[PDB]
Design a protein around this ligand. Structure first.
Ligand SMILES: OC[C@H]1O[C@@H](O[C@H]2[C@H](O)[C@@H](O)[C@H](O[C@H]3[C@H](O)[C@@H](O)[C@H](O[C@H]4[C@H](O)[C@@H](O)[C@H](O)O[C@@H]4CO)O[C@@H]3CO)O[C@@H]2CO)[C@H](O)[C@@H](O)[C@@H]1O
Ligand SMILES: OC[C@H]1O[C@@H](O[C@H]2[C@H](O)[C@@H](O)[C@H](O)O[C@@H]2CO)[C@H](O)[C@@H](O)[C@@H]1O
Ligand SMILES: [Ca+2]
Length: 697
């Protein structure tokens, strides 16, 4: 019974004995501590985790009409991860929207940081600051910072909220090649008690004529605040009506418009020729969710700044949130003058983006940028464009390429499927937006069905390629034949994509005739339960949408709902009492041992435990990467990780299995079972939404 399964999994997630939450009531990234993949420690947490917590409590409210849990989750989010009687953005009022920030270039290796604050390109004007002040009386940013150190494992302490154990921390600072393995974690509120004397951590990342001042700064993740809005959209659809909290979700959707702006508010398209123009009015708005917005200031401090982001990843867009923020049906139109219009344009533009990126096979390709190379380089000749933004197959990050993970298929396509259903349910079956959502989800669903297996396991070679009955690699194509073997009670879902080509230039939906030069190979079957739970919701919302549109399930809708039912049954067999549990192998945990964390020469500082970094065990940086410094490895930067209960296993596996000459694990791979918060919520909400939308059909 899928309602009972939802409630059982809910109970497991909320059970204090299972370890998903800290003593402060904050959800961790994962129950387990030794994990490194986006946060670099399992008891960090993310705005992502909070947004999933809201989604979980909204579904609990639907069944029980007990909305006190959703409100407690919102309160806890606001207390610990939205930095709004403690002033956590203490100089935001000094922000100058006519000069929002000082330009610095991004660089292709972390080696090349700190980046000079040259001001080479004057920032354009910020058209939101005045409206937001008019609406709220303050420009204090109501968005989640993306990263907390929940247990104060890094030891920085919480500068601006003394009673909290959880600390605002950040990591990524140094461009497209700085993987999770390559950062230097640092406090968001840096008064220079840690880092380099009289400088803090700032001088790893930016250079000025003079030592940096103490400063605070935050960065959101736009997909997380949008998911929070998506959860509140659903809560209201399911009966929630407390205006005190709905107004907070509106305010978050209002400030989330900062993720619609070019990084330095340069006019969209203006640097196609390598020479940007400072934006004016709303002409630096691209009406998409770019990777972040960030804001910061001094800690006699009298200055503050904001940046949008120029790089857009399709997997961050949330059309349900955009619908929620632009329509009376959605109920969360923000109070600022132009917020409704902005989100209305954004919803349409997001659907155009997905159509533009729809590959020949059916997966959606990466995204687009207004700042080629992160320094407003001229666009390569013949690069495909979308509203004068240049196609990028790997938005923002190249290590690993950010659209190679299949999780960035199910996460956005789940929302496109939701919107398809939402449009059809109210009787919109003919708008251009409906037609784009419908086309994208139909094609994607049909794509995905070739690569997801239940009760059987696909045949693959050692590099992860699916094989056909002749033992040939399945390299995309429309009608792949994949050899299978029996695997009762198991499921297999891709983890990886390999891209080639580009979409045709976008000239509007009326001109769209496919992307026959854009191809993808799907590979690396996995048992990722989080990707699975997102996929099952995608199947269920798509199926429900075909019924709301046509009056019954289509042939493809039937396939989708039937596969969802079987996947939910197979996954339930893997519940271990803490969560849906599957082994996973980690090739990449060799990077717990690699000397690849860059520090500039001459830079020495104090970490949060008082330990000197980088310390003595350095090697020089790669000259080919243009730096002038050194590398250390993970546990040299983070010596506490050697005390983890799983560290001996991992270290012994490295010393007995890793072959440096071949670059391969030859006596077993590092193998883990993780209970990630977001993954367990994706699963739980899949049981619930199958119950709601398919029921006994
Ligand atoms: O020049 C003005 C101003 O710049 C400040 O430096 C900025 C950088 O310009 C900016 O690129 C950098 O952005 C980081 C961000 O801080 C990280 O939080 C973010 O991490 C992402 C992560 O990549 C995702 O995997 C995860 O999902 O979400 C987080 C949140 O989005 O990565 C981006 C880069 O990709 O942030 C700096 C601010 O901290 C200077 O510090 C300042 O002095 C200048 O005045
Ligand atoms: O950065 C995207 C997303 O990654 C999640 O970790 C993924 C990882 O990127 C993928 O390589 C591995 O195979 O699967 C894990 C678990 O799904 C991470 O948990 C998210 O926080 C993060 O947003
Ligand atoms: Ca790298």
């Amino acid at each position: 019974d899928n309602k009972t399964r939802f409630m059982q999994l809910y109970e497991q997630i909320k059970n204090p004995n299972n370890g998903y939450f800290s003593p402060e009531g904050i959800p961790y990234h994962s129950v387990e501590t030794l994990i490194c993949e986006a946060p670099d420690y399992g008891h960090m947490t993310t705005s992502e985790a909070y947004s999933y917590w809201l989604w979980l409590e909204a579904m609990y409210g639907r069944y029980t009409q007990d909305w006190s849990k959703l409100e407690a989750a919102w309160d806890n989010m606001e207390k610990y991860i939205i930095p709004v009687n403690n002033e956590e953005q203490p100089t935001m009022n000094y922000y100058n929207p006519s000069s929002p920030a000082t330009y610095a270039a991004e660089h292709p290796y972390p080696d090349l940081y700190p980046s000079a604050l040259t001001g080479q390109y004057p920032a354009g004007n910020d058209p939101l600051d005045a409206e937001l002040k008019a609406t709220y009386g303050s420009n204090e940013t109501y968005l989640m910072h993306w990263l907390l150190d929940v247990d104060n494992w890094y030891g920085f302490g919480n500068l601006l909220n003394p009673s909290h154990t959880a600390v605002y921390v950040n990591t990524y600072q140094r461009g497209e090649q700085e993987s999770v393995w390559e950062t230097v974690p640092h406090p968001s509120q840096d008064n220079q008690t840690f880092g380099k004397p009289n400088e803090g951590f700032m001088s790893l990342f930016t250079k000025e004529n003079q030592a940096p001042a103490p400063q605070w700064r935050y960065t959101n993740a736009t997909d997380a605040d949008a998911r929070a809005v998506q959860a509140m959209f659903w809560a209201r659809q399911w009966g929630y009506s407390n205006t005190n909290y709905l107004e907070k979700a509106k305010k978050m959707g209002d400030f989330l418009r900062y993720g619609m702006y070019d990084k330095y508010f340069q006019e969209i398209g203006s640097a196609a020729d390598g020479s940007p123009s400072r934006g004016a009015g709303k002409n630096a708005c691209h009406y998409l969710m770019a990777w972040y917005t960030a804001w910061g200031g001094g800690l006699y401090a009298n200055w503050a700044w904001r940046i949008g982001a120029s790089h857009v990843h399709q997997g961050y867009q949330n059309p349900v949130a955009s619908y929620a923020l632009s329509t009376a049906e959605g109920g969360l139109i923000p109070n600022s003058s132009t917020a409704r219009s902005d989100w209305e344009k954004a919803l349409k533009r997001q659907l155009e983006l997905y159509t533009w990126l729809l590959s020949s096979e059916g997966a959606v390709a990466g995204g687009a940028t207004n700042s080629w190379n992160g320094n407003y380089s001229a666009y390569p000749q013949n690069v495909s464009t979308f509203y004068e933004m240049a196609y990028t197959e790997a938005p923002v990050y190249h290590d690993p390429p950010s659209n190679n993970w299949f999780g960035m298929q199910v996460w956005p396509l789940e929302r496109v499927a939701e919107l398809y259903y939402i449009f059809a349910e109210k009787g919109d079956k003919s708008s251009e937006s409906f037609h784009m959502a419908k086309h994208v989800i139909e094609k994607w669903i049909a794509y995905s069905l070739d690569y997801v297996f239940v009760g059987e396991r696909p045949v693959t070679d050692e590099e992860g390629y699916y094989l056909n009955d002749a033992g040939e690699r399945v390299l995309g194509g429309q009608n792949p034949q994949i050899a299978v073997q029996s695997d009762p009670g198991e499921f297999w879902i891709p983890a990886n994509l390999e891209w080639s080509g580009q979409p045709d230039p976008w000239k509007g939906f009326d001109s769209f005739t496919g992307n026959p030069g854009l191809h993808v190979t799907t590979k690396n079957p996995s048992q990722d339960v989080g990707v699975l739970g997102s996929y099952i919701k995608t199947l269920v919302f798509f199926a429900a949408g075909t019924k709301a549109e046509t009056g019954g399930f289509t042939a493809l809708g039937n396939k989708a709902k039937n596969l969802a039912k079987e996947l939910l049954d197979a996954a339930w067999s893997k519940n271990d009492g803490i969560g849906i549990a599957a082994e996973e192998e980690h090739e990449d945990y060799i990077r717990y041992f690699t000397k690849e964390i860059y520090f500039p020469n001459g830079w020495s500082g104090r970490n949060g435990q008082g330990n000197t970094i980088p310390g003595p065990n350095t090697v020089p940086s790669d000259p080919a990467k243009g730096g002038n410094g050194v590398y250390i490895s993970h546990a040299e930067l983070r010596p506490k990780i050697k005390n983890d209960p799983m560290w001996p296993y991992l270290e012994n596996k490295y010393q007995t299995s890793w072959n440096p000459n071949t670059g391969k694990w030859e006596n077993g791979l590092p193998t883990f079972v993780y209970h990630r918060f977001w993954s367990q919520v994706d699963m739980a909400t899949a049981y619930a939404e199958y119950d709601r939308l398919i029921g006994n059909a």
